[PDB]
Structure 1
């Protein structure tokens, strides 16, 4: 997966991700009104939302769980794969706020209005490997959290501790740890967005064959480290050169560059890993935008079109039917 935070020319804050996986997880878009009692029938535990929530997820026995989402206050959160380097506790740790892996997304969005509130709450938190149901194990995750201040954080639990990083890059992918990727960025200080039209190689004149010679050296594969580098620099270039032009579609242009394509990222089980969907949350507006591998048209669900004091969880069907404008 690849997460991205981007500010538009109008001062609006976009946040979302490419969700890159080789299967459907039975997903739908899910809306939860404020003051709603989410009931986990498995362990008879409950969570009452303080804030209305909207995001992509799945419902297990009437209990909502999210992959990524936002709330009415303009807080966004997304979970991304984090293999090898993650470490969850086997059981609750006495004295800590213990949050089961699958519930972390909802725990953030239901409870807190800002990155600052989340940061404070995470100081004494611990992520625990208790699953939603014993036959549905948790996956290995880390999270990116972002809000209307334009600040983002990265949350990674290692065996050492629950790390909370300020994210000044605007991006997240997968393993290794976040500090590893930040240090990796230093390898690419030689990249240039500006054309290099020629090079005098002594008695041989060299000429650029086309645009783009300044970025030769940028990695083109789909591994987490390469995707991180590409999005970090594509984002930086757009902000440097085109701050006053940034709008919703630009978010998709950036992520499309690191989206997986059917056939070329094959798992050991011979399945194609794809960018299943790409979400873009407009935090100020409470609009969850998304498209899918099958249907590239952007769909918009606006939580403000719902009754935020409603008494039902609402869902919207994941759109996988290509939407074409028939001009004539």
Structure 2
């Protein structure tokens, strides 16, 4: 997985969802009066409306990522072997990872509010059900001001400011930031010949400033390439050019089927790619097999409802036959 934020007049938030198998992903709008029952903290009978992509395997919104009607985004990304969930601890707000996106997005309008809510968080090892055990995750949260990373590991709970608005998988966020130090020299412009003034070295290609940028599908490499591509991106401000650039950034680090074998020719690939406009409450997405951008606008629904609104995903290529 790769999650990013991007600014181009509006502020966008979204992710590549990378896994082996598609589990009936749907776009789900949770309206304001859909009751959230939490196992160990107080219920939210009335809360902010949410739109995101969820696993369509329950009548509870099991979100992989989502934004709320106040412009706050949150995404859970695989963090296998690094994530550690805890026992219920007295004095803490004990929240299960499966409840965590509803818990935050339900009641926070900004990342600063999320920071205050997270001060007493303890992420607890309680499964949604026996049939559906917890995934090992870490989280990116973002609004129009800033983004943060939340990591619950064996040593504890850390909330990091994210100066680049990017997150992938393992290892911890502090290693990911540190590793960018190694790429300081990379550039969008042709470098000078610093190697030796005694010989002539030919600029035989454009793009030589970026040589050294890693192009493989591993977690650290995608973090570096997504960061360089996001930070150096240029768009145009209009919505369509803006989301175009966003999906180009995500394309840069997507995983193609066949290239990442996780054992026995079982391939990890980018099942979908999302781009959310935080100001307008629009969830846009592509899928591996549908290149066309599909848009679901949360504000076109009756957000005073109390039942989940589900949009099944367009998963076949939608071709414009021009003749």
Determine if the TM-score, normalized by the shorter chain, exceeds 0.5: yes
| Structure 1 residue 39 displacement after superposition | 5.7
1:304 and 2:302 matched: no
Match of 1:108 in 2: 104
Q: Does the Cα contact within 8 Å between 2:35 and 2:306 map onto a contact in 1?
A: no
| Structure 1 residue 47 displacement after superposition | 4.5
Superposition TM-score, scaled by structure 1 size? 0.92
1:98 and 2:89 matched: no
Question: Which one of the candidate residues 45, 62, 65 is aligned to 1:65?
Answer: 62
The CA distance in 1 between the partners of 2:59 and 2:167, in whole Å, is: 31
Q: Secondary structure at the match of 2:113?
A: helix
When structure 1 is superposed on structure 2, of 213-222 and 277-286 the one drifting more is: 213-222
Match of 2:126 in 1: 130
Q: Secondary structure at the match of 2:256?
A: coil
**What per-residue deviation string (whole Å, max 9, x for no partner) do you get for residues 74-103 of structure 1?**
1110000112222111x3111111111111
Superposition TM-score, scaled by structure 2 size? 0.93
| Structure 1 residue 67 displacement after superposition | 0.3
Match of 1:164 in 2: 159
Number of matched residues?
320
Q: Does the Cα contact within 8 Å between 1:27 and 1:56 map onto a contact in 2?
A: yes
**1:11-30 alignment to 2 at 5 Å?**
11-30=9-28
The CA distance in 2 between the partners of 1:311 and 1:120, in whole Å, is: 28
Q: Does the Cα contact within 8 Å between 1:127 and 1:157 map onto a contact in 2?
A: yes
**What per-residue deviation string (whole Å, max 9, x for no partner) do you get for residues 161-212 of structure 1?**
2111111111000111001111000001111210237678567532122111
Q: Secondary structure at the match of 2:232?
A: helix
The CA distance in 1 between the partners of 2:178 and 2:256, in whole Å, is: 28
Question: Which one of the candidate residues 201, 205, 209 is aligned to 1:206?
Answer: 201
| Structure 1 residue 243 displacement after superposition | 7.4
Q: Secondary structure at the match of 1:221?
A: coil
What stretches of structure 2 of length at least 5 have no aligned partner? none
Q: 1:200 to 1:82 in 2, by over 3 A?
A: closer
Q: 1:156 to 1:204 in 2, by over 3 A?
A: same
The CA distance in 2 between the partners of 1:137 and 1:36, in whole Å, is: 23
Match of 2:30 in 1: 32
**What per-residue deviation string (whole Å, max 9, x for no partner) do you get for residues 219-260 of structure 1?**
111111000000111112126xx6768611000111101000
Q: Does the Cα contact within 8 Å between 1:197 and 1:213 map onto a contact in 2?
A: no
When structure 1 is superposed on structure 2, of 59-68 and 21-30 the one drifting more is: 59-68
Q: Secondary structure at the match of 1:19?
A: strand
Q: Secondary structure at the match of 2:98?
A: helix
Give me the CA root mean square deviation: 2.1
| Structure 1 residue 291 displacement after superposition | 0.6
| Structure 1 residue 25 displacement after superposition | 1.9
The CA distance in 1 between the partners of 2:83 and 2:292, in whole Å, is: 35
Match of 2:72 in 1: 75
Match of 1:185 in 2: 180
| Structure 1 residue 152 displacement after superposition | 0.5
The CA distance in 1 between the partners of 2:274 and 2:17, in whole Å, is: 8
1:231 and 2:226 matched: yes
The CA distance in 2 between the partners of 1:303 and 1:128, in whole Å, is: 30
What stretches of structure 1 of length at least 5 have no aligned partner? none
Match of 1:50 in 2: 47
Match of 1:279 in 2: 274
